[PDB]
Short mmCIF file of C-alpha atoms in Angstrom, two decimals:
data_model
loop_
_atom_site.label_atom_id
_atom_site.label_comp_id
_atom_site.label_asym_id
_atom_site.label_seq_id
_atom_site.Cartn_x
_atom_site.Cartn_y
_atom_site.Cartn_z
CA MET A 1 52.02 -37.17 -128.06
CA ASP A 2 51.13 -39.48 -131.14
CA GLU A 3 53.63 -42.11 -130.03
CA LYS A 4 52.46 -42.31 -126.56
CA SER A 5 48.66 -42.59 -127.71
CA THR A 6 49.57 -45.47 -130.25
CA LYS A 7 51.66 -47.18 -127.32
CA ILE A 8 48.41 -47.06 -125.00
CA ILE A 9 45.88 -48.09 -127.83
CA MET A 10 48.22 -51.14 -128.65
CA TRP A 11 48.61 -51.94 -125.02
CA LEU A 12 44.76 -51.65 -124.24
CA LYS A 13 43.97 -53.82 -127.43
CA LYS A 14 46.55 -56.60 -125.59
CA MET A 15 44.98 -56.41 -122.32
CA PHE A 16 41.26 -56.29 -123.55
CA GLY A 17 41.77 -58.78 -126.40
CA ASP A 18 38.53 -59.63 -128.08
CA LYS A 19 36.39 -57.38 -125.70
CA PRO A 20 35.40 -54.01 -127.30
CA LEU A 21 37.47 -51.22 -125.72
CA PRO A 22 35.16 -49.16 -123.38
CA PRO A 23 35.01 -45.63 -124.34
CA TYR A 24 36.62 -43.15 -121.96
CA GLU A 25 37.48 -39.21 -121.80
CA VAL A 26 40.78 -38.86 -123.82
CA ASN A 27 42.53 -36.03 -122.27
CA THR A 28 46.18 -35.27 -121.23
CA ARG A 29 45.89 -36.48 -117.57
CA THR A 30 44.09 -39.79 -118.49
CA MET A 31 46.62 -40.46 -121.26
CA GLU A 32 49.66 -40.00 -118.85
CA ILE A 33 48.16 -42.28 -116.06
CA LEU A 34 47.40 -44.82 -119.02
CA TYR A 35 50.88 -44.42 -120.33
CA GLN A 36 52.44 -44.96 -116.74
CA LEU A 37 50.32 -47.92 -116.22
CA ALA A 38 51.35 -49.36 -119.76
CA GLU A 39 55.00 -48.80 -118.97
CA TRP A 40 54.80 -50.52 -115.52
CA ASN A 41 52.89 -53.38 -116.93
CA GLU A 42 55.43 -53.94 -119.74
CA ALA A 43 58.23 -53.75 -117.47
CA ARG A 44 56.71 -56.23 -114.90
CA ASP A 45 55.46 -58.64 -117.65
CA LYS A 46 59.09 -58.99 -118.91
CA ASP A 47 60.44 -59.43 -115.24
CA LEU A 48 57.67 -62.00 -114.46
CA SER A 49 58.21 -63.89 -117.95
CA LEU A 50 62.05 -64.08 -117.09
CA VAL A 51 61.25 -65.50 -113.46
CA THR A 52 58.62 -67.99 -114.82
CA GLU A 53 61.29 -69.35 -117.22
CA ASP A 54 63.93 -69.68 -114.75
CA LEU A 55 61.54 -71.41 -112.41
CA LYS A 56 60.84 -74.04 -115.04
CA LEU A 57 64.61 -74.64 -115.43
CA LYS A 58 64.95 -74.89 -111.52
CA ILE B 463 109.60 -105.07 -125.79
CA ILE B 464 111.91 -102.31 -124.63
CA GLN B 465 109.66 -99.66 -126.46
CA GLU B 466 106.46 -100.92 -124.86
CA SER B 467 108.24 -101.52 -121.38
CA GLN B 468 109.37 -97.61 -121.51
CA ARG B 469 105.85 -96.49 -122.23
CA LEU B 470 104.69 -98.19 -118.79
CA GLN B 471 107.51 -97.08 -116.80
CA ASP B 472 106.24 -94.95 -113.80
CA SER B 473 102.58 -95.48 -115.06
CA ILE B 474 101.06 -95.55 -111.76
CA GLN B 475 103.06 -92.27 -110.58
CA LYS B 476 102.00 -90.54 -113.78
CA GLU B 477 98.30 -91.38 -113.18
CA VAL B 478 98.36 -90.59 -109.39
CA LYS B 479 99.60 -87.02 -110.38
CA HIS B 480 96.78 -86.45 -112.74
CA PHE B 481 94.29 -87.79 -110.55
CA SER B 482 95.66 -85.30 -107.76
CA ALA B 483 94.57 -82.40 -109.71
CA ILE B 484 90.98 -83.45 -110.69
CA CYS B 485 87.93 -82.14 -108.91
CA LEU B 486 85.73 -85.13 -107.86
CA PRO B 487 82.38 -83.08 -108.13
CA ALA B 488 83.00 -82.61 -111.84
CA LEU B 489 82.66 -86.24 -112.51
CA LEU B 490 79.00 -86.67 -110.98
CA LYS B 491 76.84 -86.48 -114.00
CA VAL B 492 73.11 -85.80 -113.53
CA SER B 493 70.24 -86.20 -116.33
CA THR B 494 67.76 -83.58 -116.47
CA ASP B 495 65.72 -84.59 -119.76
CA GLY B 496 66.57 -88.36 -119.64
CA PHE B 497 69.05 -88.00 -122.59
CA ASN B 498 71.54 -85.22 -121.50
CA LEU B 499 74.33 -86.19 -118.81
CA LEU B 500 75.40 -82.84 -117.31
CA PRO B 501 78.09 -82.42 -114.70
CA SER B 502 76.26 -81.72 -111.37
CA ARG B 503 78.74 -78.62 -111.18
CA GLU B 504 77.12 -76.98 -114.17
CA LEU B 505 73.61 -77.17 -112.75
CA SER B 506 72.56 -73.46 -112.00
CA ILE B 507 71.33 -74.55 -108.45
CA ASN B 508 74.87 -76.04 -107.76
CA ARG B 509 76.95 -73.21 -109.53
CA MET B 510 74.92 -70.45 -107.29
CA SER B 511 75.02 -72.59 -103.93
CA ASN B 512 77.91 -75.05 -103.77
CA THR B 513 80.72 -73.96 -101.69
CA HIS B 514 83.32 -76.08 -104.23
CA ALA B 515 82.11 -74.40 -107.37
CA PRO B 516 84.80 -72.00 -108.70
CA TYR B 517 81.93 -69.46 -109.36
CA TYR B 518 80.93 -69.60 -105.39
CA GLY B 519 82.99 -66.36 -104.96
CA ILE B 520 81.26 -64.31 -107.55
CA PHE B 521 77.71 -65.44 -106.60
CA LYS B 522 78.45 -64.74 -102.99
CA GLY B 523 79.37 -61.09 -104.26
CA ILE B 524 76.08 -60.90 -105.91
CA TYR B 525 74.09 -62.20 -102.91
CA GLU B 526 75.71 -59.65 -100.71
CA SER B 527 74.99 -56.93 -103.43
CA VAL B 528 71.33 -57.69 -103.72
CA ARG B 529 71.12 -58.47 -99.90
CA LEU B 530 69.69 -61.92 -100.37
CA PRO B 531 70.71 -64.38 -97.34
CA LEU B 532 73.01 -67.24 -98.17
CA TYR B 533 70.70 -69.65 -96.39
CA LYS B 534 68.03 -68.88 -99.10
CA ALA B 535 67.18 -71.24 -102.22
CA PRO B 536 69.29 -70.50 -105.24
CA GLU B 537 65.81 -70.38 -107.24
CA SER B 538 64.64 -67.42 -105.14
CA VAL B 539 67.35 -65.01 -106.59
CA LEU B 540 65.49 -63.90 -109.78
CA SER B 541 62.13 -63.55 -107.82
CA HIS B 542 63.97 -61.33 -105.08
CA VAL B 543 65.46 -59.14 -107.75
CA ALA B 544 62.24 -58.72 -109.61
CA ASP B 545 60.63 -57.56 -106.21
CA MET B 546 63.36 -55.17 -105.69
CA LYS B 547 62.67 -53.68 -109.30
CA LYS B 548 58.98 -53.43 -108.02
CA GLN B 549 60.33 -51.59 -105.09
CA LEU B 550 62.49 -49.07 -106.84
CA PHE B 551 59.40 -48.40 -109.21
CA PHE B 552 57.37 -47.90 -106.10
CA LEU B 553 59.76 -45.43 -104.69
CA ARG B 554 60.13 -43.38 -107.88
CA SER B 555 56.31 -43.15 -108.03
CA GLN B 556 56.30 -42.00 -104.32
CA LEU B 557 59.18 -39.31 -104.73
CA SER B 558 57.42 -38.03 -107.97
CA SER B 559 54.14 -37.65 -105.83
CA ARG B 560 55.84 -36.01 -102.91
CA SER B 561 57.95 -33.58 -105.19
CA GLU B 562 54.55 -32.49 -106.96
CA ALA B 563 52.76 -32.10 -103.30
CA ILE B 564 55.76 -29.89 -102.16
CA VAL C 399 109.02 -118.96 -128.68
CA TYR C 400 107.54 -116.52 -131.20
CA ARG C 401 104.13 -117.02 -129.83
CA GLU C 402 104.82 -116.44 -126.16
CA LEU C 403 106.95 -113.12 -126.92
CA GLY C 404 103.92 -112.03 -129.11
CA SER C 405 101.59 -112.45 -126.17
CA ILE C 406 103.86 -110.34 -123.60
CA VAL C 407 104.31 -107.61 -126.38
CA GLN C 408 100.21 -107.72 -127.02
CA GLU C 409 99.69 -107.23 -123.14
CA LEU C 410 102.26 -104.53 -122.64
CA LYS C 411 100.81 -102.62 -125.81
CA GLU C 412 97.17 -102.84 -124.70
CA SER C 413 98.02 -101.61 -121.09
CA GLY C 414 100.04 -98.79 -122.86
CA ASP C 415 97.18 -97.67 -124.99
CA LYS C 416 94.61 -97.86 -122.26
CA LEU C 417 97.16 -95.67 -119.97
CA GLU C 418 97.47 -92.97 -122.75
CA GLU C 419 93.78 -92.88 -123.20
CA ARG C 420 93.26 -92.49 -119.40
CA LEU C 421 95.94 -89.73 -119.14
CA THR C 422 94.32 -87.93 -122.01
CA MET C 423 90.83 -88.12 -120.14
CA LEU C 424 92.47 -87.00 -116.72
CA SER C 425 94.12 -83.95 -118.58
CA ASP C 426 90.58 -82.45 -119.62
CA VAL C 427 90.73 -78.74 -118.42
CA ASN C 428 86.82 -79.43 -117.58
CA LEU C 429 87.89 -81.82 -114.81
CA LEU C 430 90.81 -79.69 -113.40
CA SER C 431 89.89 -78.03 -109.99
CA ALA C 432 92.43 -75.24 -110.81
CA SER C 433 90.24 -73.82 -113.64
CA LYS C 434 89.92 -70.06 -112.92
CA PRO C 435 86.24 -68.91 -113.37
CA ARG C 436 85.60 -67.67 -116.78
CA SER C 437 85.30 -63.81 -116.76
CA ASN C 438 82.53 -64.02 -119.46
CA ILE C 439 79.23 -65.72 -118.77
CA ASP C 440 78.88 -68.79 -120.65
CA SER C 441 75.98 -68.94 -123.32
CA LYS C 442 74.73 -72.19 -121.72
CA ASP C 443 74.35 -70.27 -118.33
CA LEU C 444 70.71 -69.24 -119.02
CA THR C 445 70.16 -68.23 -115.26
CA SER C 446 73.14 -65.77 -115.25
CA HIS C 447 71.84 -64.30 -118.54
CA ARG C 448 68.31 -63.90 -117.26
CA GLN D 104 72.10 -59.53 -82.80
CA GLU D 105 75.77 -58.81 -83.84
CA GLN D 106 76.97 -61.61 -81.43
CA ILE D 107 74.49 -64.05 -83.20
CA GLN D 108 75.48 -62.94 -86.56
CA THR D 109 79.21 -63.61 -85.65
CA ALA D 110 78.35 -67.04 -84.23
CA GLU D 111 76.47 -67.95 -87.54
CA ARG D 112 79.34 -67.10 -89.65
CA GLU D 113 81.56 -69.41 -87.54
CA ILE D 114 79.07 -72.43 -87.91
CA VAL D 115 78.93 -71.86 -91.92
CA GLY D 116 82.93 -71.98 -91.80
CA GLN D 117 82.96 -75.41 -90.22
CA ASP D 118 80.52 -76.92 -92.60
CA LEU D 119 83.34 -76.35 -95.46
CA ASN D 120 86.09 -78.18 -93.44
CA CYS D 121 83.92 -81.47 -93.27
CA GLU D 122 83.54 -81.62 -96.92
CA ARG D 123 87.44 -81.55 -97.44
CA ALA D 124 87.76 -84.60 -95.18
CA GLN D 125 85.15 -86.43 -97.12
CA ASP D 126 86.98 -85.58 -100.38
CA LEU D 127 90.13 -86.95 -98.78
CA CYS D 128 88.23 -90.31 -97.86
CA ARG D 129 86.88 -90.70 -101.43
CA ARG D 130 90.40 -90.15 -102.84
CA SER D 131 91.78 -92.45 -100.41
CA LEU D 132 89.18 -95.10 -101.30
CA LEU D 133 89.65 -94.65 -105.09
CA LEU D 134 93.33 -94.95 -104.82
CA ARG D 135 93.11 -98.30 -102.67
CA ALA D 136 91.21 -99.86 -105.39
CA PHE D 137 93.77 -98.53 -107.93
CA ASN D 138 96.30 -100.04 -105.91
CA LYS D 139 94.55 -103.46 -105.79
CA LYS D 140 94.05 -103.42 -109.71
CA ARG D 141 97.73 -102.60 -110.20
CA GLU D 142 98.92 -105.32 -107.70
CA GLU D 143 96.87 -107.90 -110.14
CA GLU D 144 98.47 -106.46 -113.21
CA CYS D 145 101.84 -106.80 -111.57
CA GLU D 146 101.18 -110.52 -110.74
CA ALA D 147 100.48 -111.14 -114.33
CA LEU D 148 103.57 -109.67 -115.38
CA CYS D 149 105.52 -111.72 -112.68
CA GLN D 150 104.06 -114.94 -114.25
CA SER D 151 105.32 -113.92 -117.72
CA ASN D 152 108.64 -113.33 -116.47
CA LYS D 153 108.78 -116.79 -114.62
CA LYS D 154 108.15 -118.25 -118.15
CA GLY E 102 80.48 -100.26 -91.95
CA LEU E 103 78.26 -97.32 -92.60
CA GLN E 104 81.02 -94.98 -93.74
CA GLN E 105 82.42 -97.60 -95.99
CA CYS E 106 78.74 -98.39 -97.49
CA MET E 107 78.27 -94.68 -98.12
CA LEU E 108 82.01 -94.24 -99.60
CA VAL E 109 81.61 -97.16 -101.92
CA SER E 110 78.27 -95.96 -103.12
CA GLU E 111 79.40 -92.28 -103.65
CA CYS E 112 82.73 -93.54 -105.48
CA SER E 113 80.68 -96.00 -107.55
CA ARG E 114 78.58 -93.05 -108.79
CA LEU E 115 81.64 -91.04 -109.64
CA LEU E 116 82.93 -93.88 -112.10
CA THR E 117 79.51 -94.76 -113.58
CA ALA E 118 78.77 -92.93 -116.74
CA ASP E 119 75.64 -95.32 -116.25
CA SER E 120 74.18 -94.49 -119.83
CA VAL E 121 77.50 -94.84 -122.00
CA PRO E 122 77.71 -98.17 -123.55
CA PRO E 123 80.62 -100.14 -121.80
CA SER E 124 82.91 -100.37 -124.83
CA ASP E 125 83.98 -96.70 -125.25
CA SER E 126 84.02 -95.13 -121.77
CA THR E 127 87.51 -94.87 -120.46
CA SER E 128 87.13 -94.89 -116.65
CA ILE E 129 89.06 -92.93 -114.12
CA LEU E 130 92.24 -94.91 -112.91
CA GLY E 131 90.68 -97.68 -115.09
CA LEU E 132 88.26 -98.58 -112.14
CA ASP E 133 84.97 -100.25 -112.83
CA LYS E 134 81.91 -100.47 -110.31
CA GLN E 135 83.00 -104.11 -109.61
CA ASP E 136 86.39 -102.92 -108.32
CA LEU E 137 84.68 -100.81 -105.70
CA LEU E 138 82.12 -103.41 -104.84
CA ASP E 139 85.17 -105.59 -103.65
CA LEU E 140 85.89 -102.88 -100.93
CA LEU E 141 82.40 -103.03 -99.48
CA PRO E 142 82.11 -104.83 -96.07
CA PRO E 143 81.03 -108.61 -96.00
CA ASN E 144 77.26 -108.79 -97.07
CA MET E 145 76.37 -109.93 -93.31
CA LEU E 146 77.76 -106.74 -92.04
CA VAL E 147 76.01 -104.48 -94.90
CA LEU E 148 72.83 -106.25 -93.97
CA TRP E 149 73.35 -105.69 -90.34
CA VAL E 150 74.31 -102.05 -90.77
CA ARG E 151 70.95 -101.41 -92.85
CA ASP E 152 68.76 -102.96 -90.17
#
């Protein structure tokens, strides 16, 4: 559990930047939804970065 | 004079035989950054779309595999594969939802 | 007699040297149409790597 | 739609034959320029042989 | 006239390493851009083709 929680807190800090993280109800279900969202966003951001750098070359 | 005359013997027929083996498109140089002349055949747009590139048969197999039509722009390839990965992730979510509902 | 023979050898030699430089150029593997595609992706092929 | 896709494949096959005919034209022009330049060099050697 | 103008300009670009200083570039078949300009139609015919 602690690795998923650290990945979510790190990802939320990266997404919110200097904005204070809004408090939320931390439970199993909200952490699972946030974990899937964080994995999906990391995968999509990698794919988008590769496309953007190829479009610059092209 | 005998030695230098022997070097030049059949000179025309030697050059023509070597010239016959050359790919004319490989001579055509283009500058991307003003300083570096690259053969036009090394440009990724041409490697991927030019019928005379030695890699054309490979990129054709990749386009058939990814179901990208041959009339499309070669810059659309990475964006199409990224949208196919988005589609795979969506179908994975959908199957997970439906299996949980069942 | 010596000066004219020297001109003819100089012209033949310059023509010979320029022929050998052109034959070496025309023999570059990168210019040959029969270059089988490399099985490995070239490190310069950024698009295929991406 | 199969008939259309078959005729589309035949059109793409024809574009490939036009490029070969153009490569022959470019080679034939370069070899004509080369023949002219080698005739001039042969005329220079003929003058040296007359001397 | 149009085919000749296009072929000479295409072949001129195959010879020109435009950015390499002229002393060190071995040209193919030893041909320069000047050797191809001689294969161009008469200048009157070129102007008429362009118009």
